[model samples]
Each structure stands twice: as structure tokens, then as C-alpha cells.
Target: MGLMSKEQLIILAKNSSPKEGEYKKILELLDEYNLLNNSVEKNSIDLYLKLNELSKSIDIYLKKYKNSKRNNALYQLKSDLTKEVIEIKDTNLKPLEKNIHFVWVGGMINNISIDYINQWKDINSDYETIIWYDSEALLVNILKKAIIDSSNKEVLTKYESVLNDNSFDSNKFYRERMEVIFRKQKEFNNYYNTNDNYTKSLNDVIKVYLIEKYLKTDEELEKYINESKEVFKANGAKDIREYDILDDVELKSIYEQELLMRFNLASASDIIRVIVLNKLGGIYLDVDVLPGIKKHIFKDINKPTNISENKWQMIQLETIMKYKQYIKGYTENSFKNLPSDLQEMLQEKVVEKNLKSDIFQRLGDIFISELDTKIAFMFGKIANQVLISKKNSYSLNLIINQIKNRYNIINKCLSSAIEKGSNFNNTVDIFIQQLNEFYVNEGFFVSKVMGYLGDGYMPDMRATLNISGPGIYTAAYYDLLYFNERSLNPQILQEDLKYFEVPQALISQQTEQEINSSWTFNQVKSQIEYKKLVEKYTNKSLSLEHHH
Candidate 1:
């Protein structure tokens, strides 16, 4: 029962199959010591864990230091392992297995991103790292599985043509998706009666004018707040100190809570992260936001953005007042009933004759106070880059269902566009056809939907974030949290499984690298402002070339 060489341990660990009597031999050798080198030790730890030998893995970590060469990542490795083991014993929460998932789709994945992916795989060796690269097939497979699980024939029939078709074409599927977007845009343009490029540009110029006014510049936000400081104090802004009133250390905490409002789900990987994580429960990390420990320094990150931190409270207040339109709708839907705490806090801000006092204060209070989590654990926190759940989780199931419904709706929208194209002699239809033809001939797909909403070079319209990414993920998790919170509601059945917290390090706020990445919705919105130079479109609604 003596130990084999370090090579033998790895060879054994990597090769060991618990089902084939190899588990006993590995266990026998684990009466451990200096035999546990980092790479060798890591391999054994993985093998033991997979064999459900959590106790062995935990003990192995404490036993592993022969003063051999070391990497700092071993620190996070041990920490995460300890946390997982402790939680398992303390509470049977997160019934999730040990697995780490990463999704990289639409190829052209740069070398640097690949390095980051591998870094996590090495550091978080406790979990089996799984990367999903099959783009179109994965999408169809996720949909097919959901459709079957739901047992919905209408939904199945709509897709049956594609499902059953032996002569299937990817372009046909992609083309239809393009059509829905085109028609949607036409609805936007036709409503404004911008039939030609000249007319469209004139109308778009008006948007640029507003964009110039308050399109969220850091300097602009600070100036506006400084100028409006009197207005805020005159109201009851100070009372709701949740405003570094909330951002200092509280910023990251609230960000995880405000997860529903993000719009970064527009890439193949972004969408796949949700579906794949749902189908196979585990932790998912983005390539851009690499994870590590203190000693392991990341060389890629840059200097901090030039901004004063103390203004975070005022910055948040400005965001609320500026974008209160979208905030207002989301708030009323999320917080219909006024809680005792927020209700009293909100009353202080109601001015007799001031403008937008209640609307502004109501949203401000909603932002400050547990974001509605205190009184009613409404929607739990969320993150696109960081996610954890069990397979077919009540939380993930809600998201999967929402995704299916969106697929159906987009198809129906395309169906309506096609039928109406005939009635009106397909004016926008052929234009859309020609535009896509230009895309395929020149590049694969051009992200032409630019302006305030997007960058000129969008990866893909179908991958648009709000329509199909973190939006649905957050929406589902919120539904889960809200459903469970309804213990007060006598009739509704509450789900037992719910979201717990993940390490705060999981999300590193948006970085410069992410924007420049080809996969992002827009890494360079300001690089080339298309609205300024749209004297170019004639026959097509949009035309641009950016191949990634």
C-alpha cells in the first residue's frame, strides 16, 4: 500500500475509473503526504471528488506541501474547495454537482480569451470544466428539448418544418430571424414616415440631438448632479441614504441585486450560457472577466477609470432621475405594493408642488432599500458571467420556458411580416432581402442597427441581450424569488429551491477589453458614430461591414 511516483498519481487520477475497481487503489494511496504536489495533487483531488470522496479531497489539500514549486492560484483553489465542502456538510443547499461551464461561440475567439478560459480550468480544477462550441446545433437542441419537455404540439408544429426537414438550411433559419428584426425596424421607420434614406436621416438626426444632450457621459452625470444638488436636498434625497450612501463597498452588492437590468446577452456564448447552465447545472464564468486569487496578478487589466468615488450616491440618483421612464415601468411592475419601510421613506420626498416628486422618490426609494428584497425577497440577485444552479432547476426552468416563448413570438412576428409583405407588395420585405444579400455577399452578417441603442458592428441581432440573454435569466430568477416569497399568498405554491449567494469576486464590472471584443453587443459605439455619417444609405435601411 505504498505510494507510486508523482507521475503515477496523475496517470492514476486521470486514468482512474471509480466504477472499475480503480477507486480502491486510488483511495489506498491517498494515505497522503508530500506525494501531493500541485499538478499531481490537483489530479488526485479531482479523481477523489468525482468518486464522491469530498473528505479525501479536503484532507488532501491540508496535506499538500512538500515545499515544491507553487502557483498562487492554489490559494483560490483551496478556498473554493473548503467553501463547497463546508456548505455540503452545513446545509444540503446547492444540490449542484461539481462542474464548471464555459461557452465560446461564433468562432474568431481570440487567443487571449482562450488563455483566460484555460486559466480558470486549471485554477478551478475541482469542477469538471465543460466548454460548449456547437452554435446552431446547440440552439436547436435546447429548443427541441424544451419543446418536448413542455409537450406543446403547437410550438412543436411551428418548428416541425425545420425539425423534420432533411433538407434543412441554416440560412433559412437565420434569414427569418433577420426578417423579424427588419420588419420591427420598418415599423419604427414607417411610423416616423421615413420612407427614404434622406427622410430617415433627418429623423435620426433628432435622436442624435437628444443623445448629445444626455446620453450618459461621466462628466455629464457629475455636472448635472452638481447643478441639481439643490433640487435633491429641497426634496428628500438625503433621507434615503441608500444612494456610497450605497456605492462604496455596497456598489458591487447592489449590482448583483440589480442583475435584472443588464443587457449583455447578445452573443452566441451569452445566450448559450443561460441555456447550457440551465440544462446542466453548474457555475459559468465569462472569458473576459477572468477569476483568480490575490497573489495571481492578471496582466491584461488596465488602470481604474478616472472618476471620484464619493459621487457614487449622487451618480445613482442621477441615473434614477434621468432614466426614470424605463425605471418607472419596471418599478411599478416589480413593486406594486408599498412596503412599510419604503412607504414611510417615500412619503418624506413627496413635495406639494415640485415636479416628478413622487415618481422620482418612489424609484429612488426602490433603488435604496434592499431593492425590494427586505420586505419581499422579490427577485434575487443575478449575473450573466457568474451563475450556479441544478439541472432543470425551478429557477432555470422558468428561463427556459421564457426562451421558448420568445422563439415562438419571433417566428410569429416573421410570419406576420411575410403575410403583410404580400398585402403591401412587400416593400420592406424585398429591401430586407437585398440588405441581407449584401451581408452574405460581402460579410456574413452586419450589425447595422446602430445609434443610441447599439454599436454599428453588432455580432448578431438574434443574440441581442434584452430580447434573449441576461434579460430572461434575471426575469426567471426574479419569478423564482417572487414565487417563493408569496408565503403570504394562500393559493400559490412556493418553490423550495432558491438562489443563495456567490462570491462577490464573480463579477468584475464592465471592462475596456469586453467592449473591444468582437462578441460584445458593442465594444465601440463611439469609434464611428454612424448617425453622423449616414448620408450613405440609399436602397437599404442599414449597410455596414465589420467581419469578426
Candidate 2:
């Protein structure tokens, strides 16, 4: 790891002859491999051969020369020869791969040497098969052992054992512990700021940390933690604290990136752990939503321009993957047209491309399947709550009410689907599930959006959500999850509104009135009147103070 002593290479150079034939022979391998070029290459080659010839030629000179002097010259010659063999030989592996197989990449970044291979191999048994032409230096191994013995975690933790050890700071050890903590904080800050990139990563971690650790109230802590979980989930974090120190925006990005990855933007391996862990127990817990939310987006919410028109013409689920499927079908169809020679070359490429397209198309289906599963799971949870609670035993009627509640959510979700021109069915479940997850995981209680049914008001739990800002948001969380009953409060909020900026965009809405014979929504004019109320009021409330 450390740089070689300055005179190391020079001592080896002195043993080799600058103009000897053996040295010139060695130059061929180095030159062929592009390790060294003509003029300087020949001199290096000649010098190595001279050192070898002299070291072996006279016992008197050999006695005067250090073993390192003779070995260094030989090592230079061997290194050049090995590179020539690695480069000139055409093998299954690429030149660099072949070179790397023998040479472990060391040094800070690039600009590394081949000498680290042996020590690296010894340390990392995973690479025992790779044999560097020049073996590891014994001195380096001895030094590595010495450092490992002195600088291990056990040694530091067991301070009393090493109390009298020279490595211990006597004055610091004798000082009060609180003083040490203060002094160490200064040192930590100084070391942290030294590297710009490192400082930034640290700052990012600090941001998330402040939001999580310093906040006092359990309700507040849980809110940020849950929201951060969503943001972190989207960003690809698998655990609660993985990016606890990252910036809020970065955390949000982690969520978005991860969502895309789950949708096949990236490898499944990259997000496999997140899905299994988070979906099962990590966060994004609430899964209930109106059925129409999924329906309007993927199905139909809007009537045609004419009231008489049957299907909504604008929303298009097909358009999203139209090009992808067309290309896929084209590839499938074109297989018959390939010439034999070209077919051999292009068949694999064509098939692979088609496979990739299919994977992309499957993402939509995956979203639907997973959303449905989430809805079913949460529905089960809520059903159990109703059954066990003393206030109301779970019954078929409540399940019906829950389904009705879902219908409202479906309507709200559809509004966005219609705006985006997405097939109501294609995006309804996605938005509904997304919204529920956002609320439930953050510990907020969602109420049934009860609508007035001309005669009397019934549970009109539609997608009409009234998300209060952070304080009420915290209260709602406690009310819904009944954490206060559980004696577990969130401890994150009261700290300084670290990330509690003004409210974010207000809740979105998608209105749905499925009954055909409803008297109030019976006429087209009346239906428009209903939508106006929703748009101006509940939907408008979704706005954040930061928004213009």
C-alpha cells in the first residue's frame, strides 16, 4: 500500500548492464507488450542484463551487493517478460483481463504496479490461483503482519489491556471522557472536511441523520422515518438507516431510481433485497385504495366528447408500449426474411433485443399484479382490525364499506390518469397503491370520504383525502396506527422542521359515480356540477405553501 522506498528501483538498476545482449532480449518482451518503448527500453534491458551478469560473474562483487540490488534487477527483467507474454498471446480473456489476472490492481487509483499481486493474493485467498511471475517480497509480508497485529479493532476496544502501551496517548487517556469526546469531535470535523467528495457524502448522511436521530417526539420521528423510508425506498435503500445521513432530495431520488429499477429500468438483482424486505416489513405499508382508482386509469372514467359516445377515446394504455411491441412483433415476423449468412450474425442480436422489449412491457403488468396483492393484504389487515376491536366486530358489512372506500380512492387516482391520457385501467391501481403507501407508512389515518346521498349521508369513502400538514399529519398518524395506545410515539418532528418545509403538492382527485340510475348525478349537467365542487375544494387543498 505504501510507496516503495526511493532507492529501491535504483538499487536494482545498478546491477543490470545497459548494453548486454541478454538485456536486449528482455527488451523484446517489454517492447512487444508496450510496457516500454525503444530508446529507454533498450537501456533498461541492457542495465538489467549487466546486473545479472555481474552479480553472477564475480563472488567478490556479489558479496558487496545487497540481495535487494540483485533481486530488483531480476524482478525488472521478469516483469517486462511477463507483460510481453500476457499481451502478445491471444487468449480467451482480453489483454487487460489477462494482465489483471496476474496483476492485482493496487495503488490509489490507476497508475498501479504489478508488484502487489503476490501480497494481494496472500491477503485475498479468492485470488490464490493467480501467480505473478515475480513472487511477493518477504519484507512486505512481515511489515503487513506487524501493522495488522497492532491496528486491529479488538486491540482498540480492549483499551485497558493496552493501557501502558506506547501507542496510547497518555495525556488524552488521563483526561476526562467528556473532554475527549469534544476533542474528538473537532478532529472528526477536520478530517471529514479534508476531502471534498468525502465531505459531501458525509454531509448527505448528516442531513438524513439530523432528521432521524435529533428529532425528539416519537410521532415526529416516525413521520420523517416513514416518509424517508418511502423516499429511500424509491432511491434503492434496503434498510431504514442505509442513507440516514443523505440529503432529503438524494433520499427521494433513491426511491425514484429504485421504483424504476423495480419496473425493470435496472437489474432485478439491484433491487431484489429491497422488494422482499420492504414489501414484507420495511415500509410503504398502507395498501388500500378505491378500486376505481385502478379502474379509471386502466379502464374508462371519461365518456367520449359526446355524452352518447361509449368509450373514452383519449386515454391510451396501448400507446405507452405501442412502439416497443411493434418492434418486438416486427422482429418476430422478420425472422423468416433473413439470409443464411446474415441470419447467423443477426439472429442472436435480434432475439436479445426482442427479449429486452418484452421485459419492459412486463413492467406495467408487474405494477398491476403487485398493487392488487398489496390491496388484498391491507384489506385483510383492516378486516382483522375490525374483527378484533371492541368497538366494532369485523363483519361483511364493514368489508363492503371498505370496498366502497376503495371506490372513492379509485376516482381520485383516475383524475391523474385522465390528465396524463393513460388508459384508466393501466395506471389506476398504481396511483392508488402509491398514495396509500405514502400515507400508511407515514403513520396517518385515512378517513372514508363520506359523500351525501341526497336522502342521507353514508360512508362515501372515495379518493377524497384531507392530508393535514406536518402537525396534523403527525396527529393523524398516531390516530390511525393507534401508536399512542401502543405507547410508542414518533420522535422526529419537533427538532427544527429539518425537512418539514411547507406542505407538498396537495392530494389529487379522480371522481367516479358508477351507479347509472342515481337521481342527483342522473343528468349530465348535475355531474359537471359535482366535479366542480371536488376540483375547487378537496383537490385544491392538495397544494403546498411553497407552490405559487
Candidate 3:
């Protein structure tokens, strides 16, 4: 071209140091002459520009060249540098505090729920018990002053009455205070009824219950009544969404995550749980968790993260069984040859494991402990329902930002699909594909669900569970026990959970009426259908859409 050819520029790029002004000038000159021959050279120029007179720190290099193209040299360099930086940040730990948090936003505090809270309050009295509920203003009202800074004593004072005076109409108080949230839970149940995965199953019973409650002979003009709705919305205060006290990114994430959970699923509790526990560090329960089963089990749990186990055995069993089936199917039905998204996901799973063990024999012979180790080593862990941590944990911050990034990507794609008339399904597909990459953290193995089936893990298309519910909770939490970033070895790679030594379950699965909790899936479905419908028809939307 001018003074230098593409080959000459590449050698120049190789020898150049970002420390020198001449180095960046050479990049500008090369870019001006269009001499970025290969991907690495182009990436080098961008990295030098981002460095702008930079340092030798691994984080700096990785941060600058983060989204840029990199050949093997830069790629491997990043891999090494990232681990180095992780090690550096691992030691910057402010350990967890003693507290327990529960999010009881959507529903009434029934006998069961009231008992659950009181039980935890009594058993864990040493740790401060804080329950986050929708305040009179109709927001989760992530409390700043209520916990410690009680200059505003009225908010803190009222929290005690509910616990001390069981005579208070908690059901009425809970449902009436956040009438819109309760009413919309019903609206959501109807929309999510379109999910066909649980169709011809237990959910059909609930579907019929909803129809009977809403549509009178399919001709009634009566709809969800709008009353006392936003009469004071015009009186303006800063919105919960626009509030400046919290991390701006997490605030936006909570809003969008809750919005989608409400719109697509039946409730917005899961994201609410993550955000609340994330902002104010403490244990999070699903409101229905049967408490006092393991008395004082958490007393000695001084770890940064103290999480209880959920039923991941079924997940592990299914994944292992499917891997064998699919690998065999790979040769016969040619899943490997089919060349589809599922195929691509599964293929990578195989590649990542590179399992060359003998014959890959039946799980019938594997011990429970052995299988646990295998699953932990091979894939990742699935733990949820109970999570504990201290306030403003570094890992929680990472997860919130991760959710922010992925949620924005999904939002952009959805918006583009609306504008450009692109296939909505394809956009959803790409977004889920991204979840496996960006949605997981050190604590949870949710993205591995992509390896198995259509509908993202063969489960019903429960967007809430994968996105903010199960995945986000797990993703939002990183491994404090298993891997110590401060350690040179990254800790032993073993099972993440330490199960409670309870004689029975902590979160009762038996008699709950929620539709999806196994058999109660039908019962809970029916119960919620009636409860939410009655609330919708009976209660008026109390708050206006305004922030006043």
C-alpha cells in the first residue's frame, strides 16, 4: 500500500507494545491504510486504542479487548488473564453478615405462610429477620431504613405488629395493600395458560376453573373490574423504577424481570427474591417453605453463601440418561448428522467433557455418592429454593449485571423483531442460546439444560424458572464454598451443596396447592385459579399506575 504491506503491519503489530504512543499511532496508520490482514491484527489495533496509554494488568487487557476478535494467541492470553483477575478479586472479600430475608410480595399470608415466617423468626432469632413485601405505595419498597437506619421508625414499627399480633387480618392486609399485584397475578395465570407443555395434564383442571370464574357462558361483558385505580397516581414521587438509592442496573433488571415474570408467568416472586436477597443479603425462601424442620441448622453457617439443596437428583438422572440415549441416537438416528440447535448444544457438551471412559456403562451400578461426584465434575450443579448470603456480596453484583446484559439483549431482539418483522421464534431461539453462555455463574448449572431437549430442557416453557427463577437465583449466587478465589487451586471440584440432615423435607412438597409442585400442581393450580380470580373480581386496583 504505502510504506507497509499487510504482512509488514502484522509483524509490526506483533512487536509493538501498547505502552508507547508510537504503538497506537502505528495501529491508526495501519487502520487508515486498511492493512489489518487477519482477525488478531484488527483486534490488536482495537485493544491498543482501548488501552489508550495503559498497563500490563490482565484485567486491563481483557477489559479492552473483551468484545473484539482474537486469534488463539489473544484468546489463550485472555483465558489466563481472566483467571488471574478472578484470583485477584477473590481476596477482596467482605464476609457475610448474620440475617435472613424472605420476599412475600404477591399473595396473602395464609395460616401456612404465617407459620412459616414465625418459625424462622423464632429459630433464627440471633440473625435479624427481614421480610420484604409490597408496601402501601405498591412497590417491593426495598427497605434502606427499615433494617438498621430506623430514623423513619413508622415503617420499622409496623413490621413487628404482624409478627406479634397474629389476630391482624394478614390475608386482607397483604392482598388489599398491593391490590394491583394480586389482580394482575390472575391476569397472568390466564395468559400463561396458553403454555401447552402441562396441557392434557393436571393444569387442565385449573384452566377450566379459570374459565368458569371469568367467562359467563362465554358472553358476559364483565371483565376484571377496575376500581380505586390510581386515583392518586397524579401525585408524583420518584418511581421505584427510577429510584436512585440502589444500583441503577439492578433496579432496571428487577423491573424488567418482574414485568416479564408477571406478563408471561403467573407471578413475579422469583426475580423479586433474587433482587431483594441480592440488595439486602440474607436467606430467601419461596414463602411456602415449611420452616423449623432443621432447627438452628443455619446457626453455624458462617460461610459467605449458605444454600440449602433442591431436588437436582432427578435432573442429574435425566441428563445422564439423555446423554447416553442421544449419543447412541447420534450414530443411529444421526442426531450428530441432523445439524440442528439441539445437536449443536449436545455436541458441545460432549466436547467439553471429552469423556473417553470405558463403554459408558449403565447408571444402575453407580453409587449415589459416586453419581453425585460424576454429575458435579461432568456438568454443573442445580441448587435453589433456599439461598443465604451477606449484603452487597461481590458475586451477587456480577449476577445482577449479567442479568442486565442478557435482558437488554433479549429486549433489543424483541424490539427489533417488532420493527423489522423478523421471526419472533428465531429471536427467542438466539436469546436462549445466549442464556447458556451469559446466564450461568459459578454456583448454578442452568445453562447445561440447553444440552437436552427442545423448549430448553424438555420442561414446560416456564420462562420465569429458567430466566429469573431457578437460573437467576443460582446465577445470581456464586460458589463461596466450593471454589475459593483466594486459593491457588480454585478449591476441590465436588458437589456444591451440603444437604440438611432433616428426617423430612424443609420445603413441603406434599399438600401444597400450587399446580407445579408435583401432585399439588393440579391442586395449587386450581387453588390459585380460584383465589386470584376471586381477588380480581372482588378487590379493586388500589394504586394508580403513577408513582405518587
Which lDDT values do the candidates have, in the order given? Answer: 0.36, 0.26, 0.36
Q: Relative to the unseen true structure, what is the C-alpha lDDT of residue 497 in candidate 3, on a scale of 0 to 100?
A: 28
Residue-wise lDDT of candidate 3 within 138-160, one digit each (tens)? 21121111111221122223443
Counting clashing residue pairs in each candidate, in order, gives 2, 64, 6
- Put down candidate 1 lDDT per residue, 244-320, tens digits, no spaces: 12222332222211111111223434455655665556666666554422211212222225533322222322223
Candidate 2 lDDT: 0.26
Worst 10 residues of 2 by lDDT: 382-391
Candidate 1's C-alpha runs over 4 A off are 1-92, 135-267, 292-383, 422-463, 484-501, 507-512, 518-548
lDDT value, candidate 1, whole model: 0.36
TM-score of 3: 0.38
lDDT score, residue 65, model 1? 38
Q: Which portions of model 3 miss their true places by more than 4 Å?
A: 1-95, 135-250, 253-257, 260-267, 290-380, 421-459, 472-548
Candidate 2 off by > 4 Å: 1-22, 25-91, 94-218, 226-548
All models, RMSD in angstroms: 23.5, 32.8, 22.7
